[PDB]
Each structure stands twice: as C-alpha cells, then as structure tokens.
C-alpha cells in the first residue's frame, strides 16, 4: 500500500517521468505477465509497479536495457527457428 510518491519522486527526479516510466512498466506487467521484482502483497499492478519504481532498481534506462535484451533474445530465437526450418528442409 502507498500513500505518497515523494520517495519515488526524488528517486527519479520528476512527477511526469515517474508517471511515464511506471505506466510503461505496469503495462508490461499486466499484459506481458512479467513477474514483479517486488513482493506482491496482493496489491494491484499499479501499486506493485510503484513499489518497483521506488528504489526497486527500476528506471527508464533500466527498462530500456530490459527491452533491448528482450528484442535481441527473441530475434535470436527467431533466427534459430528459421535455421531449424532450413535444416529440416535440407
């Protein structure tokens, strides 16, 4: 449960950056099914995303690293799948 975002505000430096980053992370949470980095405590996606953003070692650059890794690994998986299809044809 949360009552104020001041800690996260000073953690990131701005209200609006906080909003955007947290919204994107929670978007990844709700539809991507990605497990939170913070214990849930039956809280919603919004609250757990906020808890992650406050000192849970999450920022814009961190999630950028995450998505870069995700796209790289899925492209690698697709390349491996295409290679497997080619080998099956061969």
């Amino acid at each position: 449960a949360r009552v104020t975002v001041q800690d996260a505000v000073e953690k990131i430096g701005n209200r609006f950056d906080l909003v955007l980053v947290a919204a994107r992370r929670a978007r990844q949470m709700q539809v991507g099914g990605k497990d939170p980095l913070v214990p849930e405590e039956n809280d919603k996606t919004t609250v757990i995303a906020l808890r992650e953003i406050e000192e849970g070692l999450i920022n814009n650059q961190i999630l950028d690293v995450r998505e870069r890794q995700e796209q790289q690994e899925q492209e690698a998986a697709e390349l491996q799948a295409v290679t497997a299809i080619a080998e099956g044809r061969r």
């Binding site: 949360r2 209200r15 909003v19 919204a23 929670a26 709700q30 919004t46 906020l50």
Partner: peptide, 16 residues
Amino acid sequence: TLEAQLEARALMMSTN
C-alpha cells in the same frame, strides 16, 4: 486506464 490511475495517484491524491 492504468496510466490515468497512476497519474491520479501521482498528482491528484490529496496528500500531495
């Protein structure tokens, strides 16, 4: 939308 909910929590909450 969760974006709007987060926006409300960040700014529109009375405590802030």
